[PDB]
Design a protein. Structure first.
Length: 11
């Protein structure tokens, strides 16, 4: 989830 969240933001 952590990784999910961050990329959501990044992309």
């Amino acid at each position: 989830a952590a990784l999910a969240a961050a990329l959501a933001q990044a992309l």
